[PDB]
């Protein structure tokens, strides 16, 4: 019904308004303090060296931010051997493109690169969706067979059959979340030296296909080896397949 659709739309609008207000209130001071700090640091450095011209310093900072947007780190002197568009890195980038994650830490800069990226995404996304649906359906069929094994009126004390089904689904999703969210969060927390909050935020963002780009699996050149990019892409695929299977089972229960 059109009225129901408009009611849902208005609810979404109210949710967005509330989220915008709370985000503004919970972020304004941080960036205010950062602006104050960078302004006072720039003034102190200009007073430190009278030789440096302020316009020249601004030109230098402009070139630094241009290089940052290009995708090369100016703070560390590059040896050109650790190419950012490495073969494993390119494989990870293509995997994220077809997965609709889009971290954006590395982006194509050539015009032909942009055209090829557009064509590649438009061709690959339906194929990846088809594969994900197939694997999720396979895992859902296996889980349904497991539930049919569970439905035996035994080792449940006959409390409530609906409670038993709900408990089985909850245990399945809990075990899957523990296997594919918390444990990879700990692994990334140890490997990348981040905090637990940072690692769990990275895992949630990556799996939910958001891809903010503030935290990337490969960054700051700390010698990721043993095909780190292929295995992290494989973990992404397995987790997404599991979540798709759980969603398919949930849709089966709802309908």
CB of 167 to its own copies, least distance (A): 22
Nearest CA to 93 out of 218, 223, 238 is that of 218
Could you tell me the two tokens for 176? Answer: 């899957």
* 34 is a contact residue toward ligand P0T (CB under 6 A): no
* 100 is a contact residue toward its own copies (CB under 8 A): yes
Taking the least distance from each CB to K ion, the nearer of 136 and 143 is 136
* 63 is a contact residue toward ligand P0T (CB under 6 A): no
Distance between alpha carbon 108 and the CA centroid of its chain, in Å? 19
The answer to whether the beta carbons of residues 84 and 72 sit under 8 Å apart is: yes
Choices 22-30, 142-150, 179-187, 239-247; region in contact with ligand P0T by CB under 6 A: 239-247
> 80, 149, 153, 159: which one contacts its own copies (CB under 8 A)?
80
Task: Say how many Å lie between the first and final Cα of the chain, rounded.
Answer: 19
CB atoms within 10 A of CB 86: 15
CB of 148 to its own copies, least distance (A): 19
Taking the least distance from each CB to its own copies, the nearer of 115 and 183 is 115
125 to 154, contacts with ligand P0T by CB under 6 A?
A: 125
* 211 is a contact residue toward K ion (CB under 5 A): yes
Rounded to 10 deg, the angle between the 161-177 and 228-254 helix axes is: 170
* 182 is a contact residue toward ligand P0T (CB under 6 A): no
The answer to whether the beta carbons of residues 194 and 184 sit under 8 Å apart is: no
Q: Rounded to an integer, what distance in angstroms lies between the CA atom of residue 101 and that of residue 89? A: 15
Can you give the binding site for ligand P0T, defined by CB under 6 A? 100, 125, 208-209, 240, 243-244
């Amino acid at each position: 019904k059109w009225k129901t659709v408009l009611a849902i739309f208005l609810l979404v609008v109210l949710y967005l308004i509330i989220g915008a207000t709370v985000f503004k209130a919970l972020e304004q001071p941080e960036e205010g303090l950062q602006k104050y700090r960078i302004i006072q640091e720039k003034i102190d450095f200009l007073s430190m060296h009278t030789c440096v011209q302020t316009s020249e310093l601004e030109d230098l900072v402009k070139q630094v931010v241009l290089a940052i947007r290009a995708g090369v780190n100016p703070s560390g002197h590059p040896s050109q051997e650790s190419s950012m568009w490495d073969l494993s890195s390119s494989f990870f980038f293509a995997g994220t493109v077809i997965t609709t994650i889009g971290f954006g830490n590395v982006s194509p800069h050539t015009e032909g690169g942009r055209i090829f990226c557009i064509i590649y995404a438009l061709l690959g996304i339906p194929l990846f969706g088809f594969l994900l649906a197939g694997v999720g359906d396979q895992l859902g069929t296996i889980f349904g067979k497991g539930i049919a094994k569970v439905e035996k009126m035994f080792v449940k004390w006959n409390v409530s059959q609906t409670k038993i089904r709900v408990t089985s689904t909850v245990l399945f999703i809990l075990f899957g979340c523990l296997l594919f969210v918390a444990l990879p969060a700990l692994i990334f927390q140890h490997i990348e030296g981040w905090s637990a909050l940072e690692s769990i935020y990275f895992v949630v963002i990556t799996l939910t296909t958001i891809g903010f780009g503030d935290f990337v699996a490969g960054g700051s050149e700390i010698e990721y080896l043993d095909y780190y990019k292929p295995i992290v892409w494989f973990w992404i695929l397995v987790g997404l397949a599991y979540f798709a299977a759980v969603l398919s089972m949930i849709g089966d229960w709802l309908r």
